[PDB]
């Protein structure tokens, strides 16, 4: 008791988070998108009941809490996430940081000013707000370009300022994690306070177990993403991959059976609004994934435990990991 | 009398227009950056207070109207434009399109999508706000992208439907407006409709009185960027460029005595905030030309003056030029 994280409805007790999924979205856009062009999701109405319906349903299968890790460059959009939150009544946390599409604006910036743009999220709120960020967002592609090698030290020296975590998105077939851990701890950053996403993008589990040896938190949060059935349209084989739910989620038993339990966080990487893709994509995915963001407490968590899977390590991984991964350190 | 044109105040009178800047901006940016990070600027407020006494420094000088040609992903904030539009008593036009720093929710759009995009920041207005687009603004820098030859055809086709003009970004030593009226010619719009931009950073009169001949206009538009004598500074030299503003000015003089005073606009391509480059930019700017949009009355019209242009040939340039190619047409 007594650990705080925030929250778009401001503050709330770690051990309020409950069963959290860590790497989510309300809507994948840019920045200043749903403002200019709300049309695009057939309205900004429209995109909000989609997501009040959606974490509903999220929340009736268990979940209490997302952490939506859209930053400035996915488009976040924290009034529309706290009106949601509020409906849904489901905690959501926010996210500062940079992702893979920063303007020129953030491209042109030092690692000393991006550290003042994070810390600005996080101690005196987004926009004109007041709601501040419970997670630093980063990102890399492959091999980081110079740009996103700042990003990563600007994330490390806000979290190392504030006890905030640090979240990524990889290329994991090309490994990335090793990298960004290795720019990380050149900044002094603990392993701890890192989660390497898209873990599961890959079975490669040495390098997997690699990371989680050195106490990085393991982000398998793709869950429900696979085109298998839809191999013939090819935006949706190249995001959604041509690995099952199945497949994905064994990753999950084979690092709980490797000893890493405590390393583990689970998500789907799921949204209720797409703009950053292409025109349509979020029929297809409504159609592989009706379930949303309730389809790891439904499919998953059961598929774990008829594999064996104590209901007390599921319940480590889904609700203790978050908590310690949330709880500023 | 009668024709109209939108301003960020609303509907004026083409006949009020009067001496105007073509290719103007409040603030040069990226979209949603200075609702996140205003502090960048000092302020909003300070932003907003420098950008009214320049704009009242340029009305003092003779400037009635300027044309902001920043757009969505110039980060364009149509209520600062329209706040010191108010303060200063300068008409501020505000422009739709897209400039060549568009983020992925853009990019990943049809040329049907982005004729909606612009027609819906013509027709019905900016954001929320109603306020409704004067102008059309394109980018190339060099061949056109996959991406840009759909923005350019986009801008065709919304202009076409609203009568409102398209103008350009090139990368003048390219000879970018070449490829650009192609792809504007090929979707039947009209070369009086079009201005190829920053034609003045190239002393090349073959490529400028080529489109001169076929009816385009041609945007003389950087008159105060240089950097001679601060070329140990390599970020103002790749901008600004090592040809003086007298230099500058001699095009609109040689476009003039070869028959074409109706074909020219003239401007500055100035700013008041400018976070789409390095840091303290604003500041080697505003040593370099302290009069910032005064500059074209005070000086380079009297050079002009000087040089033998008569004061009518001037006023066409300055006043007719700007009303014939604002009114929607
Ligand atoms: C930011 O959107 P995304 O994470 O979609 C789930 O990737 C485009
Ligand atoms: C959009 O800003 P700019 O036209 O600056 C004058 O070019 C970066
Ligand atoms: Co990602
Ligand atoms: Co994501
Ligand atoms: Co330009
Ligand atoms: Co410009």
Redesign the interface.
């Given at each position: 008791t007594g650990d705080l994280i925030n929250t778009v409805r401001g503050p709330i007790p770690v051990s309020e988070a409950g069963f959290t999924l860590t790497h989510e979205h309300i809507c994948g856009?840019?920045?200043?998108?749903l403002?200019?062009?709300p049309?695009?999701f057939g309205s900004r109405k429209a995109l909000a009941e989609k997501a009040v319906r959606g974490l509903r349903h999220a929340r009736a299968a268990g979940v209490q809490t997302i952490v939506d890790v859209s930053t400035?460059?996915i488009?976040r959009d924290v009034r529309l996430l706290a009106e949601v939150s509020r409906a849904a009544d489901v905690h959501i946390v926010a996210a500062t940081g940079l992702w893979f599409?920063p303007?020129?604006?953030?491209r042109?910036?030092?690692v000393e000013?991006l550290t003042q743009?994070f810390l600005?999220?996080i101690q005196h709120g987004?926009?004109?707000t007041g709601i501040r960020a419970g997670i630093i967002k980063v990102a890399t592609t492959g091999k980081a370009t110079p740009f996103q090698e700042l990003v990563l030290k600007a994330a490390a020296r806000a979290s190392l300022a504030t006890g905030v975590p640090v979240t990524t998105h990889t290329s994991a077939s090309q490994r990335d994690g090793e990298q960004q851990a290795a720019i990380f701890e050149s900044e002094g950053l603990s392993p701890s306070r890192v989660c390497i996403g898209h873990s599961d993008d890959t079975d490669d589990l040495s390098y997997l177990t690699g990371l989680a040896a050195r106490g990085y938190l393991v982000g398998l949060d793709r869950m429900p993403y696979s085109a298998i059935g839809l191999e013939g349209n090819a935006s949706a084989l190249a995001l959604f991959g041509t690995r099952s739910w199945q497949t994905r989620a064994l990753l999950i038993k084979a690092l709980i059976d490797r000893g890493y339990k405590d390393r583990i966080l689970v998500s789907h990487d799921w949204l209720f609004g797409f703009?950053?893709?292409?025109?349509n994509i979020m029929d297809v995915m409504d159609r592989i994934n009706p379930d949303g963001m309730a389809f790891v407490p439904l499919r998953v968590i059961p598929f774990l435990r008829e594999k064996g899977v104590p209901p007390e390590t599921l319940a480590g991984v889904t609700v203790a990991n978050p908590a310690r991964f949330l709880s500023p350190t």
């Open positions: 856009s840019s920045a200043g998108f403002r200019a062009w049309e695009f400035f460059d488009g599409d303007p020129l604006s953030m042109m910036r030092s000013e743009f600005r999220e987004i926009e004109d703009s950053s893709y292409v025109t």
